[PDB]
Amino acid sequence: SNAMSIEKVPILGKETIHVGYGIADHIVREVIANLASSTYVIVTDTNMARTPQYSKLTDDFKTNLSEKRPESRLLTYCVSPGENNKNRATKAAVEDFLLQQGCTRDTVILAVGGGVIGDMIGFVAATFMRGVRVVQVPTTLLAMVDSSVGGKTAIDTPLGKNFIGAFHQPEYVFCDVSFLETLPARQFINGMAEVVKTAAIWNEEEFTRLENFSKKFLSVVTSKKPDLQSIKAELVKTVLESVRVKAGVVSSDEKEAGLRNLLNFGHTIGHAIEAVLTPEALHGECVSIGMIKEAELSRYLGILPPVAVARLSKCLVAYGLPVSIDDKEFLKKVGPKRHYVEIDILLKKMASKIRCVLLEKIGKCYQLKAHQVSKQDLSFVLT
Amino acid sequence: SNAMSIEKVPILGKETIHVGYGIADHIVREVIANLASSTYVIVTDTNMARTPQYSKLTDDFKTNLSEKRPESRLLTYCVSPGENNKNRATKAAVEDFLLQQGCTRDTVILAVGGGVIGDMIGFVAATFMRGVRVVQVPTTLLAMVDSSVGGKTAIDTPLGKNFIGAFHQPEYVFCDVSFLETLPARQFINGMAEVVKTAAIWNEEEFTRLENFSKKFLSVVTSKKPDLQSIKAELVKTVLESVRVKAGVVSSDEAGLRNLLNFGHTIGHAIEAVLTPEALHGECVSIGMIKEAELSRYLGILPPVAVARLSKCLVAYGLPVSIDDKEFLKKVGPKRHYVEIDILLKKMAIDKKNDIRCVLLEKIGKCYQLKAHQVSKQDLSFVLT
Ligand SMILES: NC(=O)c1ccc[n+]([C@@H]2O[C@H](COP(=O)([O-])OP(=O)(O)OC[C@H]3O[C@@H](n4cnc5c(N)ncnc54)[C@H](O)[C@@H]3O)[C@@H](O)[C@H]2O)c1
Ligand SMILES: NC(=O)c1ccc[n+]([C@@H]2O[C@H](COP(=O)([O-])OP(=O)(O)OC[C@H]3O[C@@H](n4cnc5c(N)ncnc54)[C@H](O)[C@@H]3O)[C@@H](O)[C@H]2O)c1
Ligand SMILES: [Cl-]
């Protein structure tokens, strides 16, 4: 906000998720002051490496470290971008760099990038000398609200995604919304799927604010040179209220286990679709369609009222997301893969009951847990 | 085998370390009954794969599983032996096999082999879908008493050893002493360094037993046709009492006890870095224990008689007590001449670049103040010069 340059969210009792706009300064001081180390390492990709905000961070990091901890060193390393580099070779290359540099157990690694970087460099930190401190610095909307929080790290293999990895909690998550200034529009919209999800499963008031923000958001993000400063407060609030839900649910799952599954709203059906249509369909695009199908499932089972289905769909369309696999622009993105989406391959991906979130209303999940549903009922909504 | 065949040792208050001699059936029953899964995977190396006891274990596993869990399956995978294969490419190969065979989060992996297998397959389990259940089945003496216990897993890189890994506690450790029937003598003897070490840091009564057992142990192990069954009971006790000490230390709260396990390793790892691979780890740790004991004696802590005693016991088990041991010089050859004081000091310092500490023995079976102690480059130099 105007009144608070940094807003914090607790995770497992500690306020280590920090959100603001143009906070390189704060990131650097917080890290150096609280995570004492001989060696700090910023890891990024090529795309992020070229942006002005990235240079501001490393510059700020360099200067403060020179003042505060003269004996300590800052190191930087860049991987190539893309899901195709989220692999064993890249992990090994980052490690070989850390080892050549004589990094030890005290090393602090900052993962500056989207979910690819966050997951992969999180995993590097998880196994480096059997674990070193990592700080998540997410730079995509998706990564800011979802992937940076919860400690899930991984890489892909030629057989499938995120099959090798580790649970490794970050010391901090810093969401500097000003990084979104360079994010391509499609990726920005993709990220709103998780934002709408968190409001839909937990916060109707935020859902209302999102509806009221949609037109000016979509108008700025799709303009030629997006002016993000003009909607700065509203973007900070967007990231804040979504990550609050993710962090709250992760923390609450401690004592009320199974609340964590509510974060899967739209992912049961959406992951099944994305399995068929990746990489032409992005994850948020598939999650949006999934939330609608899953909402229709709750409706068909006599739980979600039909008006809430309509309200959810209106909000997703207003943020530029598809609400069925037959959406015209979505058909354009997926082309010849459209016809691969048959009911049978979807029921197979989702495997013989299936677990699914059943929305009760906007802002609330039915009985605060996931439910086992039959293949017959899922077939009905997918027919 | 039955209940009478098995000695258990607790780790963090649960009896998951089981020791016996000829216990493949027990291993099978215990895993299948306690670790319910669709898929059990036994991973080993070429050398172990061809031994009779390995086949006994896998045959028994197959038979019992198809009876008790007919819808489950047993898979097997074999890697090449050697520290040179304790690497990323092998870890990936094992993972690709698992994935190609459709293994999921319920998979139970058994690591049947020495410490290379234990550490590497342990690490495969640690990261597979972010972690699956692993069972350590150590087959060297060293692995039965030390490496299988404590949850440390790793592989090596060209820049050094055990740098990439994970802490991943095994569901069970099964030490079947019958695997030692096919262990080459040099490796069998190598394992005795850690056995002597555990007795020396913690259990003077066991040290006495090991002294009394030494002549017999060595004549059996170094014969042409070793008959291990004739010393069965005493070998089981040997394993049991060393792994007891490791497990008790791992189970502590009283942090600082963990460092007592490093007795012999401060100087020993430095010697090994210069002399590997011609010298084995336990051979260097033996020498290391002697020098660290001399250090404690020099500092006025350890009485001289302890150094004599330790030295006699180590040699009676076929281990060297100096870098100029006749047989040790044959193994290492021209690398001996690179063991200078400055490179040892450099390595001991590199090993503590995060944080030079050393265990100081107070007498046989007791460490001074139950913790490691900072020692100077001068005093180490004095003892190594
Ligand atoms: N850990 C979890 O629980 C979790 C949850 C959801 C997704 N994920 C993971 O997240 C990954 C997808 O992440 P993503 O959607 O952030 O994609 P991404 O990291 O692939 O980034 C998308 C593209 O944007 C570039 N980029 C990132 N930030 C930028 C910025 N500020 N300006 C300009 N360009 C930028 C990247 O170089 C890349 O080309 C997947 O691999 C998925 O497995 C993880
Ligand atoms: N995790 C830990 O805390 C820890 C502690 C100490 C050592 N280690 C590790 O242990 C490894 C060394 O283990 P090791 O000393 O068991 O060596 P190893 O695993 O290399 O085995 C030695 C040799 O014996 C063969 N072999 C093993 N058991 C056999 C048997 N019963 N019959 C016939 N052949 C057999 C192997 O194929 C190999 O050729 C090192 O890589 C080291 O990093 C780990
Ligand atoms: Cl790995």
Residue numbers in the entry:
A (entry chain B): -2 to 348, 356 to 387
B (entry chain A): -2 to 250, 253 to 354, 358 to 387
Provide the authors' original text about this structure:
Accordingly, in addition to the two copies of this domain found in the asymmetric unit we identified unambiguous additional electron density corresponding to one NADH molecule bound to each copy of this fragment. Specifically, Aro1DHQS residues H264, H268, and H280 coordinate the catalytic Zn2+, allowing for identification of potential catalytic residues of Aro1. The two Aro1DHQS chains in the asymmetric unit formed a dimer with over 1,100 Å2 buried surface area. The interface between the Aro1DHQS domains in the Aro1 dimer is the same as seen in the Aro1DHQS crystal structure.
In the human fungal pathogen Candida albicans, ARO1 encodes an essential multi-enzyme that catalyses consecutive steps in the shikimate pathway for biosynthesis of chorismate, a precursor to folate and the aromatic amino acids. Aro1 forms a flexible dimer allowing relative autonomy of enzymatic function of the individual domains. Our activity and in cellulo data suggest that only four of Aro1’s enzymatic domains are functional and essential for viability of C. albicans, whereas the 3-dehydroquinate dehydratase (DHQase) domain is inactive because of active site substitutions.
